[PDB]
């Protein structure tokens, strides 16, 4: 039997709910969908809806009742969604749709995307103090999954991740960043699944643990053992590092090919992550890291050091591997239920129903060796994928994805973020789900609105005109 929500987490929740209740209520973001077989007809429906919402009767109906009525039409091949806070934004967005013009709150396509979405599970550098807290208090599905992971992590490591999420005075270190982002990744994807969505394939960059869960390669319990074992070993190892044993990590604007020649001058550098066509994260002794940084800056290339005294995906991980091996005994790798672009295995693809991959050796190899991220993405583009959806508290890896997709010739990919610092977390997920609908991916747009309890919940337009 699993541990429950701790007493301190309940105390922090009550206080956060009082802070929330005393705050300035903000208008929700509402998705208004129009569609038709022909784009020209879709454009006319948008202009007709805009005319009606400008009338006194349309002005008197809530955005939510308008969007609920729209959610019940036939959903045609040519689709658009206007995301709006008030009637003025809605009408303006609908004029854009009718005019075939672009606007920040408007998505409009002539037809569905041909291949299903790639879920991107990264996470490095995405953390911030209050990540996940707002959505936890305001979304019961997300909350339920956060609490489920909070219980497994309590059982594995002996502390509550929910306490960290709810206590604004606490911040994240190397260990707690990984397990908390994992919990947020699990809960974000299950929230999406609750509304009908699903990955055609996953790709990881920790995020590998959560990718294994959503690919059906491990149970939630064994994915949690994977992230817990790696996280606490890395945090405890990094904390004992001083002096000649410190190893830095840095981003440099070199491609894999340039790195090969550049490294001939720096015998102890290794590649941590091939992140984008000309962005590589390297690691090694501080004197050599500073020198490659100075070389890149002298060549007009950007370079940036990260905050860590240890370098994962380098030989410095060798002391941890034996203990990682011991802690992961008992996990049960299963056959994947969607595709996997494995950045541990050089970016290659594993098909749904393939042989399992997520055994103990996988997690050792992943922790010790380079992450072939840009290779996995390029493999996804080359096999027809155009929609990439990142589950994260901040869309860091989507910026890397955009660089690879453009470089592989795909200049209009669908790059869908989820949460973002200083963006309303509930509004962000409305947007994520509206985009999945517009491009034709699995999503039940009716579940974006509560069930109607009376006629005031509908608007006097098709298909719910009042008789």
Ligand X SMILES: OC[C@H]1O[C@@](CO)(O[C@H]2O[C@H](CO)[C@@H](O)[C@H](O)[C@H]2O)[C@@H](O)[C@@H]1O
Ligand Y SMILES: CS(=O)(=O)Nc1ncn(-c2cc(F)c(COc3ccc(OS(=O)(=O)O)cc3)c(F)c2)n1
Contact 393, 225 (CB under 8 A): no
Based on CB atoms, which residue is closest to ligand X, 10 or 44? 10
Three-state secondary-structure class, residue 401: helix
Does position 75 interact with ligand X (CB under 6 A)? The reply is yes
Shortest spacing between CB 119 and ligand Y, in angstroms: 16
Among 3, 14, 17, 19, binds ligand X (CB under 6 A): 19
DSSP 316-328: GGHHHHHHHHHHT
Based on CB atoms, which residue is closest to ligand Y, 127 or 386? 127
Show contacts with ligand X in window 190-209 (CB under 6 A): 196
Tokens 């890397």, located at residue: 400
Shortest spacing between CB 6 and ligand X, in angstroms: 13
Where does this chain touch ligand X (CB under 6 A) — which range of 39-47, 165-173, 235-243, 270-278? 165-173
Distance, in Å, from the CA atom of 218 to the CA atom of 227, rounded to the nearest integer, reads 12
196, interface contact from ligand Y, ligand X, none, CB < 5-8 Å by kind? ligand X
Residue closest to ligand Y when measured from CB atoms: 275
15, interface contact from ligand Y, ligand X, none, CB < 5-8 Å by kind? ligand X
Based on CB atoms, which residue is closest to ligand Y, 205 or 342? 205
Distance, in Å, from the CA atom of 313 to the CA atom of 234, rounded to the nearest integer, reads 11
CA R_g for the chain: 24
Query: How far is C-alpha 195 from the chain's CA centre?
Result: 16
320, interface contact from ligand X, ligand Y, none, CB < 5-8 Å by kind? none
Shortest spacing between CB 138 and ligand X, in angstroms: 15
Distance, in Å, from the CA atom of 396 to the CA atom of 402, rounded to the nearest integer, reads 11
Shortest spacing between CB 12 and ligand X, in angstroms: 6
Q: How crowded is the C-beta side of 266, counted as CA atoms within 13 Å?
A: 22
* Sheet containing 78-84, strands listed edge to edge, beginning at the edge strand earlier in sequence: 30-36, 78-84, 106-109
Does position 443 interact with ligand X (CB under 6 A)? The reply is yes
Shortest spacing between CB 435 and ligand X, in angstroms: 10
Which residues would be at the binding site for ligand Y (CB under 6 A)? 124-125, 205, 249, 251, 272-273, 275, 279, 281, 302, 304, 312-313, 371, 396, 400
* H/E segment holding residue 228: helix 220-239
Among 107, 182, 437, 449, binds ligand X (CB under 6 A): 437
Among 48, 323, 442, 457, binds ligand X (CB under 6 A): 442
Residue-wise burial string across 322-347, b where 16 or more C-beta atoms lie within 10 A, e elsewhere: eebeebbeebebbebebbbbbbbbeb
Does position 265 interact with ligand X (CB under 6 A)? The reply is no
Shortest spacing between CB 444 and ligand X, in angstroms: 4
Does position 441 interact with ligand X (CB under 6 A)? The reply is yes
Q: How crowded is the C-beta side of 119, counted as CA atoms within 13 Å?
A: 28
Shortest spacing between CB 19 and ligand X, in angstroms: 4
Question: What are 340's strand-pairing partners?
Answer: 202, 350
Based on CB atoms, which residue is closest to ligand Y, 32 or 397? 397
Distance, in Å, from the CA atom of 386 to the CA atom of 22, rounded to the nearest integer, reads 43
Which residues in this chain contact ligand X in the complex, by CB under 6 A?
12, 15-16, 19, 75, 167-169, 196, 437, 440-446
């Amino acid at each position: 039997e699993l541990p429950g929500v701790t007493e301190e987490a309940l105390r922090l929740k009550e206080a956060a709910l009082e802070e929330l209740a005393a705050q300035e209520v903000t208008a929700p973001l509402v998705p208004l969908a129009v569609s038709a077989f022909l784009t020209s007809r879709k454009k006319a429906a948008a202009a007709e809806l805009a005319d009606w919402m400008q009338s006194p009767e349309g002005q008197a109906s809530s955005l939510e009742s308008i969007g609920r009525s729209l959610s019940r039409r036939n959903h045609g091949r040519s689709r658009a969604v206007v995301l709006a806070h008030d009637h003025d934004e809605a009408i303006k967005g609908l004029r854009a749709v009718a005019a075939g013009k672009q606007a920040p709150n408007v998505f409009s396509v002539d037809g569905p995307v041909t291949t299903g979405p790639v879920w991107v599970l990264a996470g490095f550098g995405a953390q911030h103090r209050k990540m996940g807290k707002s959505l936890y208090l305001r979304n019961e599905v997300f909350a339920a999954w956060i609490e489920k992971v909070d219980a497994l992590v309590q059982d594995e490591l002996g502390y509550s991740v929910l306490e960290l999420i709810l206590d604004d005075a606490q911040d994240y270190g190397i260990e707690t960043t990984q397990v908390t982002i994992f919990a947020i990744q699990i809960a974000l994807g299950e929230l999406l699944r609750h509304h009908g969505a699903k990955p055609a394939a996953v790709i990881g960059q920790l995020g590998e643990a959560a990718s294994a869960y959503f690919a059906g390669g491990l149970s939630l319990r064994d994915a949690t053992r994977a992230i817990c074992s790696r996280s606490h070993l890395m945090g405890e190892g990094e904390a004992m590092l001083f002096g000649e044993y410190i190893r830095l990590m840095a981003l440099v604007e070199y491609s894999a090919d340039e790195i090969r020649e550049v490294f001939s001058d720096f015998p102890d550098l290794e590649v941590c992550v091939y992140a984008a066509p000309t962005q590589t994260v390297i690691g090694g002794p501080p004197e050599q890291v500073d020198a490659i940084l100075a070389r890149a800056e002298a060549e007009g290339k950007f370079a940036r050091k990260f905050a860590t005294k240890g370098a994962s995906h380098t030989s410095q991980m060798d002391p941890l591997l034996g203990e990682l091996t011991a802690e992961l005994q008992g996990i049960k790798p299963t056959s994947p239920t969607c595709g996997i672009f494995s950045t541990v295995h050089e970016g290659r693809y594993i098909k749904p129903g393939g042989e399992p991959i997520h055994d103990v050796e996988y997690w050792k190899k992943g922790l010790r060796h380079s992450v072939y991220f840009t290779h996995g993405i390029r493999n996804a583009v080359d096999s027809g994928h155009t929609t990439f959806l990142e589950l994260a508290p901040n869309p860091v890896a989507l910026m890397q994805v955009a660089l690879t997709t453009a470089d592989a010739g795909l200049h209009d990919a669908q790059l869908i973020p989820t949460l973002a610092r200083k963006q309303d977390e509930v509004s962000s997920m409305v947007s994520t789900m509206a985009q999945l609908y517009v491009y034709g991916h699995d999503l039940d747009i009716r579940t974006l609105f509560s069930r109607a309890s009376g006629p005031q919940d509908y608007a006097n337009i098709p298909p719910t005109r009042f008789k």
